[model samples]
Target chain A: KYYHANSTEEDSLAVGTDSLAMGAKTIVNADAGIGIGLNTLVMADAINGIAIGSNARANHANSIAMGNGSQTTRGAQTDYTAYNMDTPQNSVGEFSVGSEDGQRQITNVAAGSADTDAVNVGQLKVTDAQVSRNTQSITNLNTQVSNLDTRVTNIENGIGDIVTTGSTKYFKTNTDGADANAQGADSVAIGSGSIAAAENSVALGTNSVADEANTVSVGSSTQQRRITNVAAGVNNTDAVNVAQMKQIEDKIEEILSKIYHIENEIARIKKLIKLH
Target chain B: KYYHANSTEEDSLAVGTDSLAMGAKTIVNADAGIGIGLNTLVMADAINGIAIGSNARANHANSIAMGNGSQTTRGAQTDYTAYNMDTPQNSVGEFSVGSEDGQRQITNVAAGSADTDAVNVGQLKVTDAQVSRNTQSITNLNTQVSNLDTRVTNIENGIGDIVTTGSTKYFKTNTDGADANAQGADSVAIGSGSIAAAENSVALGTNSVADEANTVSVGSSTQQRRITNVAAGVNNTDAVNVAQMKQIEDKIEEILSKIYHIENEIARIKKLIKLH
Candidate 1:
């Protein structure tokens, strides 16, 4: 077997100046390149490229392609130019462990010290854990904000009906010195020119006069606000709503009709008796 | 005078194989250990240790102590083993600038390389800046959530009284064929078996009646919900509230008292006339 092979050799080719090639079918064409495995290749542009393992290919400047079928491509790695700063920018001349078709993981690397150091998965996991915690905290805060929004909508839209039912505080806005007078015992007058002249009476709104005892008036003779939404009365003393009064009127009309019928029937009977 | 001395000698002693010593009271005992300056010492266990400056002491294996009165301690440094990987563990074999009694900052460290080199402050600041930004974002989110919580509290506890005053749309919950009736020209009934019989009347609640032309009833004679928090009326046609009614009752009592006194005076005047 030949100790060393030259360029154009089928099994192993060391074509570059000061380059080395070994193993079956290995080709090192770049200056100072080293190809050591079967079918390993070092392209012309790959200055000082190092290709190891079967089917390894180094195409970029000063790149390293290791392991079986490994390939190096420009812009596919972090170009570490120097140290002491953040890791180098992603560019050419990288150390790769896979071909364009597949890849491999470098496991069990220790923690990184220099910024350009290759960090391991364990160290990266620490940072990922912290980021996840921060994200969860923000998510919980957003959820709380949304819940508050819903509560505000419900309160503003549904719960303020307490004041609608009734209030206990009594107030009057009249500026007249005489004010509204309720002269009778247990009487109430609310308007500037209103008067409750009888005991146990209420006069509401503007210029309302309640002259009868045990009564309520909403307006004066000329001015009135309709007293609306009244239910039917059930007892003798309950104020009858409009519908109850209308029913009584209807009954009265019916009675008048019956009385007329009775009168006609009596007249006819009398006529028959006379004829007999 | 001897520029370098042996270990057995009183001052400037170098005892280990190929070790070096200089200045007064300097001592090097381990193999390949070097000590310079006055009172510098390298312990027997510190193989290849380098101690410099006055009173510098190196006690750990392969440790380096520099500057005046400096000392080296175990487990105080990051033991970098190789490059292209993460930094090594924190263990022995450190390089120290001060003794156990004092310490000093390593000024102007250029930067780290090969994952085994020393890192500087400027490089670490980059990571600190990113972490601070993340913290600020979370803080702002938390503050927003707190503000929403306060808003919800205010809305739920204070607002929601629009429905209390009055609703224009009149409704009834009755299922029977007759239903609640407001027979007046402009009337409203709100409950089952309720009726507004008079023109411009209102019947509220269940089985209440407003037979008068202009009146509002809260309930039937058998069941009633007191109209509360009614403000005193100021106009001529306004309805008087309960407080106004009570005030009229008081005025009536006062008038009755005065009238009784007037009647007694009139009787006395008649008696006087008869006597004369």
Candidate 2:
């Protein structure tokens, strides 16, 4: 038997065939042994089927089946006896077949196997964008530490030298104060009478002396004279004493030790940073 | 039997009776029974007890005894048939008949119960005195609160009102170019100008009419014709316009309100003394 079905635009399924083709068919009656032969052919661009039974079968385009004995063949069957018929043009001939009793198979003769394109070998290169940003910060900190070290060293040396060399005179007097005739040296004096007597000398009076190498006197004539000769000389002598000199030296040494300790701490910090 | 005890001290217990005197006694039986007894022909001065039993006993002066065979008595007579007692003068008398099966017993008595004097009652008055002290404290607190209220009210009404209502004026005026003809009235002028046109006239201009009355001119030709008449005229027109008056009044009210509020706060604080 041959069947043809069609559905228009309004229907759910539509089929068309360009030409009909037939093949010889044979039929037999089991008891009478009477026989007849005939052939029928069908062709269409789309077909749908559902089947069930021991040997049920189906052929269609994009066909699906459900049940134990169901089989589906999609696309055209070119080798059948009805294959000589003119088929509809531009129809998909790709075949898909699934069988319950064996592996579902698909064969394509057009292309060979090829591998995927996403694998990378060896180590990954991760650019640390933060390094550039942090470079300035690191440099600034290093510079600050260097500057601080320099400052500390300078301070330590200054103190050390001051302590070791104890006899440096920091103040002095001119013939500008007190006991008008007593011209004191290396001492600051204060007194109007003394200042007047010591003409062109370092005046102990207010605002009379410059801030450079010069003697200064403060207070009255007698007071300036006494302080200029007595106080300044005594202080200078005392400052030069061995005990005072030793004390200053010890102070400078202590400062140097502190600077050394600070340097060690900075070095340890740098090591820790490297580990991180 | 009688027993008498007395002491002149105010908290002492006393007993008296009229009869033969009895001495206090302690009794001990060979069977390990302990008892105490007092027997006498007469009892006087608040006699406490008289008893007789198979084993008659008595104890006086804060004593105790227990058990059927172990008994105690303070005052008891075993054989006297008739006991004559005089008016008990700080004394007591005890008359009793007793046998092995028949007995007379006086259970217990306290002679001359210790007196609780007024001085003892005074010892219990501390709590009530504290309550009185607390009441006085409350009175002082109330006074302080009342004073604060009065002060707050006075501040709000008196000082606050004065501060709020008071007004002061600041005035500034400038005269340019000396006017020999103009004499400003009751005005102090600063800065000098050369104007010789008029004498005995304060000129705001170089040389011109001395403007009279309230006309302040910038030129050199204004003069004051009469001082008293001008002053009277100005005073008569001293009433300010409505807008000016309102502005002044509003400012004064604002100041007064602030002052009153501050005064009230100060008054409120006056009632409390800082604990520290």
Candidate 3:
């Protein structure tokens, strides 16, 4: 039954014999498991395993009991066989590799304390049966972003030229002081020095003028006058002189008066029977 | 038998009496010049001996009476023993460790002139003898090493490059106006659809030409033309169009030339200066 016949049951032995020369040849071969230290083991209590250095023992599967005073007690080893490892239904040393149920078992054990204890070993942020903190930080950041956007929009509208159209690109007054003006299709007059003397007149200069139609006068504070251009969002051009407006008004009145007299004369003719 | 039994003539005894225990122990057993609170000090006035505190007594020579207020007044073992810890000819405590003549210390005795006092302490800095009035301040940061040499030179010669040798890496504008130009080992032709052609010239309109080198012409009228390869920097080029100038002077002289020796040169030049 036993090779060299000195080992006990539940023990695995290799080709080598213990100092007492008594182990079964049933353990893993030389380079593997029990065969590794069978030659050094002298007791049945060392059934697993390696009992190396003074009093060290690795009786349990996959375990290594080392350190001068290390003790590998059965910390519920029977109740579990490590995560992913398979344990016999017996829960005894009936150990196999580890597994799922094993992992869950240990996880539940770590939650044993409600605060600052085993529960803390998970590290990466505390166990939150609650909400996340990162989300809160993002919300604060968004609030700042919202404030900046509103500030920008308000500033843009405040001094920024509020359009640009195909025929007219336009807008507001800036701080620099350029004289405002207008332009025309047939005539142009610019400069404060413009004047009108004879009919159809437009004079320019510090004393110049235009005495003809579709004529123009223009320059600096020295140049003033114009016609026909619309003002817009950021547009830079339109204007006309008081004299021009007055000339038009005078002719209009003169025409109306003559129309009145012509009507009076027409009545006289009508009495002479002109309607027919 | 002694100042209140067992105590030395100048010593103050805490509680007990006489030698052995006399300090019974009169307190400090240090020296014998001044002493106080002695249980059985059995000694003389202990010149300059003094002691105050529950069990404090000075008994060495040149010893002074010091301590809260048990009253042992002696300032003269016939006086000053300020230094000599290791100083060859210095006073017993003639110690000075700081940068200046500090702490000569006669121990305790406040001096007058409160506004700024202590032999009113420190005259040069003035916190002395007065009644203490605080005022005034100073700007004192003798800012040393404040000029940057590189910054000055860098700004002075920044975007400039007339130099690049060895690699022949040497190679290559308008103040738009009177403030601008190009010249040197280089020559140029600019603006106007110019071409180097003429009666030994090039007119510039379209294959047109003129004859001039390192000269530039510029205009803002929808025309973009630059010199063949203008020299860089402090470079000079171009001259006024004598053609336009003469056209002006032609009229100017027409005004001065009797409207133009009109009838005469018009005939002479017409016959001899004939063209095909």
Best by TM-score: 1
Q: lDDT tens digits, residues A1-276, model 3?
A: 111434444443332221111133233221112221232231334332322222333344322222222222331134433322365321222111122122111121111111111111222122121123433444464565556556555644542332111011221122222222212221112233233322221233223344444233332233333322211112111112234334444655665566556556545644544233
- The first chain of model 2 has a TM-score of 0.19
Q: What tens digits encode model 2's per-residue C-alpha lDDT throughout B1-276? A: 112333222221112211111123222211111122232211121122222122343232111122223333433223333212233222121222332333323221111111210011122233335445655655565566556556555644543322222211221223344311112322111123422122112223222232333222223423311111111112222212324333444665565566556546544543332321
Best by lDDT: 1
Tens-place lDDT per residue, model 1, A1-276, is: 101112233666889998887656778999999876446799997899987654678877877775546677652345554453555634345565555554433322344565444444455455557667777887887678677767666664564432432211111021222456878997766545678887888776446778865767776667666554444433333333446556545655665575566556556556755764
User: lDDT per residue, candidate 3, B169-249, as tens digits?
Assistant: 010000111211122233322222334422322122211233334222222233322221111111112212234345545
Q: Give the Cα error of residue A25 in candidate 3, in Å.
A: 12
TM-score of chain A of each: 0.50, 0.19, 0.27
Stretches off by above 4 angstroms in model 1 are: A1-13, A22-26, A37-39, A53-55, A75-92, A107-117, A138-157, A160-217, A220-276, B1-139, B150-194, B197-206, B215-276
Indicate the residue-level lDDT of B48 in model 2.
Answer: 26
lDDT for A125 in candidate 2 is 11
For model 2, residues A3-55, the per-residue Cα lDDT tens digits are 11111122111123222111122111112111110111122323433221112
